[PDB]
Amino acid sequence: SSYQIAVLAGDGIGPEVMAEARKVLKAVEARFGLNIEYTEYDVGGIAIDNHGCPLPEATLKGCEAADAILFGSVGGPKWEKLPPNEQPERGALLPLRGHFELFCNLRPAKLHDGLEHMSPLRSDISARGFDVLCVRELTGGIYFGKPKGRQGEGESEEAFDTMRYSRREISRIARIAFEAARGRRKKVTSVDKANVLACSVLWRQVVEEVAVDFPDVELEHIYIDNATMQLLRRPDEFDVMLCSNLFGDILSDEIAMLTGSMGLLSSASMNSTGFGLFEPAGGSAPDIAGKGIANPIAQILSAALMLRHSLKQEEAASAIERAVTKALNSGYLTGELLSSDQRHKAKTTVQMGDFIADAVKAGV
Amino acid sequence: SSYQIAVLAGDGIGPEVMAEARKVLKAVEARFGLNIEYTEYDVGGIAIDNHGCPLPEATLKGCEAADAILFGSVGGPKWEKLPPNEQPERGALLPLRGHFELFCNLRPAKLHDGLEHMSPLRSDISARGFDVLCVRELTGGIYFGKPKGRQGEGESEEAFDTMRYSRREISRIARIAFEAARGRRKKVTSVDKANVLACSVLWRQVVEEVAVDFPDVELEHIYIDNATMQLLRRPDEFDVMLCSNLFGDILSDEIAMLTGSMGLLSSASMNSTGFGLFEPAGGSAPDIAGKGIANPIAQILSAALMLRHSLKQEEAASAIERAVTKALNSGYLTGELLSSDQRHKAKTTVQMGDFIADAVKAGV
Ligand SMILES: CC(C)[C@H](C(=O)O)[C@@H](O)C(=O)O
Ligand SMILES: CC(C)[C@H](C(=O)O)[C@@H](O)C(=O)O
Ligand SMILES: [Mg+2]
Ligand SMILES: [Mg+2]
């Protein structure tokens, strides 16, 4: 029967890249006989303008009635002057994650063949390639721990945040990491600060407990500060990186930037029932919105991740992935992926979407 | 009159690089007529072997009687199998910082002329150069906040750490940052997670309060995740980076690795009275210890920082710095700073020390 998708395109380039993801999805629906219905809701900046808050109740209820959320990007100059805590990115994302218990974040990043030169790494390092899957715990740690707040006044006014983790929270995300590694290159690198943080001592201990179920997977532990360095020297040696909430926030951005190709990167945030929120890794790029320049690949790959993980449609997910590969090796590239002597070869957002949808229809 | 220095050389390469720092310091003492007495104490790994703990009481008392601590490096394979919390690096460093209230950490990093190629950045980025001073708050935040620990058992066993900051703690480190920027390129970039953390909301607020005393210095705020990316794209645009304890731990390592030349980098940790602990940025490199290969420049520059900040001997500090510059542009380089087709030109640890001490004696 029918699937129901909540479409939260957001701000900036969100709507124009979402339109291309819908176009590709239509080709998929036809080719594989899937019956999917979409409802669009305001979120982020547009929601503050139209409803007074970044996550309206009608949008939240709409997501509750869906099988998955296909999310664009939120934020922009306009709302930045608001205080960072009432403000559209955090205002949409933290309650969505908390409400639906989206504990698992997957952020795959790889260097694509032929695009190694866009990486900001030295050429001999980027020529080696890399392919790293960051698994980030999304609902625990210091993001949602209590108590959180402030007290006192004047010089002695103090603020406090509490990082908290339970064995139960650690083992459920660790298992995901190990199961992923088993399908990839069978290595998990767990990232912590166990020489300082009590949470990190528990983290390391629990990850080693979970490891006994996965004797085929190699486990190593690395301190977060050292990890930021090692990713610059030997990114080819990591497979799955397992991180707590805040450490994963930090490392996943570092790794994204190391690709030099953020327009290609997608993210999945899921709960244990398979419901998730699927989004491009980059921001809303408000300075390029409405010009047909934006790269829709990240939003298209988000749809592929949604098909795989929430809708259990592996063949449909794979077909999109292959259509993206065909675009990239047939010279269908957007402007930000070309040296600016090549810039006149750039394809527009719509040309990209047309090409990819056509490839799927053609049986790629 | 006389100055008293506690010498804590530690493990691995610590003693062999410390010997070269002492050699340079002797040339300085003679040239500028300084009267300095040194006492050596065990710390770290060697202290666990000889005394049963990484920071013996006799060493702590010795540091209390000194004007500054000239520190080497601690740690190694041998002690790693101990639990990360009883373990020599953390076991020496956290109590030293806490005991002497060493709230201010300075970690200068720059790309030296002629060594841009050792950076792991793409050549066009590293050709631009950079020079960034990281100012890290060292005694507050999540390192020493309470409560810290665990409770419960089984699946519901939980650990917790508390990040806490007061206005007083934030304003004292911010002022240092602004005063440094005023002597450099008059820009402070404050790094926080103000869209999630209550401490970061207070941080940003207090830094803006302090800013009113420095209308000649430009202030910007950036989120920690975004900062890890921007350092890969435009490191030349940062001057002073101002960070809380954990964010500074992370960013300072990223920046160090971006130089490709960690043997050149030193660190100062100081309290408000001028007492400090001065150390090389890198580790104890136990695999090269005792071979005459290690680069003593970081330990020599630590001594220069000690002369400047704790002993208020600016001319003596500067003379060392210039002697290091003369070595680097006269081809006095250690092995890790040469491409391995050049490796036969490498100077040993002692040759480096002799050259630098000789330069100081010659009036550089
Ligand atoms: C907007 C912010 C709350 C969010 C986070 O910190 O998780 C973002 O940085 C991210 O990586 O998704
Ligand atoms: C050894 C560890 C406690 C220490 C820290 O986290 O401050 C180290 O990583 C550093 O940067 O000096
Ligand atoms: Mg982030
Ligand atoms: Mg560190």
Distance CA(A349)–CA(A77), nearest Å, equals: 23
Residues of chain B positioned with their CB less than 8 A from the CB of A250: 224-225, 228, 250
Query: Who's near B360: CB < 8 A, 6+ residues apart?
Result: B24, B27, B28, B31, B319, B320, B323
**What does the H/E/C string look like for chain B?**
CCEEEEEEEECCCHHHHHHHHHHHHHHHHHHHCCCEEEEECCCCHHHHHHHCCCCCHHHHHHHHCCCEEEEEECCCHHHHCCCCCCCHHHHHHHHHHHHHCCCEEEEEEECCCCCHHHCCECHHHHCCCCEEEEEEECCCECCCCCCCEEECCHHHCEEEEEEEEEHHHHHHHHHHHHHHHHCCCCEEEEEECCCCCHHHHHHHHHHHHHHCCCCCCEEEEEEHHHHHHHHHHCHHHCCEEEECHHHHHHHHHHHHHHHCCHHHCEEEEECCCCCEEEEECCCCCHHHCCCCCCCCHHHHHHHHHHHHHCCCCHHHHHHHHHHHHHHHHCCCCCHHHCCCCCHHHCCCHHHHHHHHHHHHHCCC
Q: Is A253 annotated as a binding residue?
A: yes
Q: Which of A11, A41, A42, A143 is catalytic?
A: A143
Residue owning tokens 């957001």: A10
Mutate to test the pocket of ligand 2, among B43, B87, B89, B163 (most ligand atoms within 8 A of CB): B89
Q: Is B289 annotated as a binding residue?
A: yes
Beta strands B240-243 and B218-223, pairing class = unpaired
* Inter-chain residue contact A159 with B164, CB threshold 8 Å: yes
Provide the shortest C-alpha distance from residue B338 to chain A (in Å). 16
The dihedral sign for the CA sequence A109, A115, A118, A119: positive
The CATH number given to whatever domain includes residue B75 is: 3.40.718.10
Give the CA count within 13 Å in the CB-facing half-sphere of A263: 21
Catalytic residue list contains A193: yes
Residue owning tokens 């390639």: A129
Residues of chain A positioned with their CB less than 8 A from the CB of B119: 122
Query: Who's near B161: CB < 8 A, 6+ residues apart?
Result: A162, A163, A197, A198, A199, B142, B145, B148
Burial of A7-18, coded b for 16+ CB within 10 Å and e otherwise, reads bbbbbbbbbbbb
Interface of B with A in 102-121 (CB under 8 A): 119-121
Query: Who's near B99: CB < 8 A, 6+ residues apart?
Result: B60
Distance CA(B173)–CA(B63), nearest Å, equals: 23
The dihedral sign for the CA sequence B198, B200, B206, B208: negative
Residues of chain B positioned with their CB less than 8 A from the CB of A120: 121-122, 125, 232-233
- The structure was resolved experimentally with X-ray
Q: Is B46 annotated as a binding residue?
A: no
Provide the shortest C-alpha distance from residue A17 to chain B (in Å). 23
List the single residue in A with minimal CA-CA distance to B86: A195
Is A234 part of the contact surface with chain B (CB cutoff 8 Å)?
no
Is B152 part of the contact surface with chain A (CB cutoff 8 Å)?
yes
Q: Which of B249, B326, B354, B358 is catalytic?
A: B249
Experimental structure resolution, Å: 1.9
Closest by alpha carbon to A228, among B96, B227, B192, B158? B227
Q: Is B16 annotated as a binding residue?
A: no
Closest by alpha carbon to B333, among B324, B341, A323? B324
What residues line ligand 2, using a CB cutoff of 6 Å? A 195-196, 225; B 89-90, 93-94, 249
Interface of A with B in 119-138 (CB under 8 A): 119-123, 125-126
What's the domain range around A351?
Answer: 1-364
Q: In Å, what is the CA distance from B99 to each residue of A68, B60, B266, B276?
A: 53, 9, 22, 12
For residue A162, give the DSSP letter. Answer: E
Closest by alpha carbon to B246, among B268, B224, B231? B224
Q: How many domains does chain B have?
A: 1
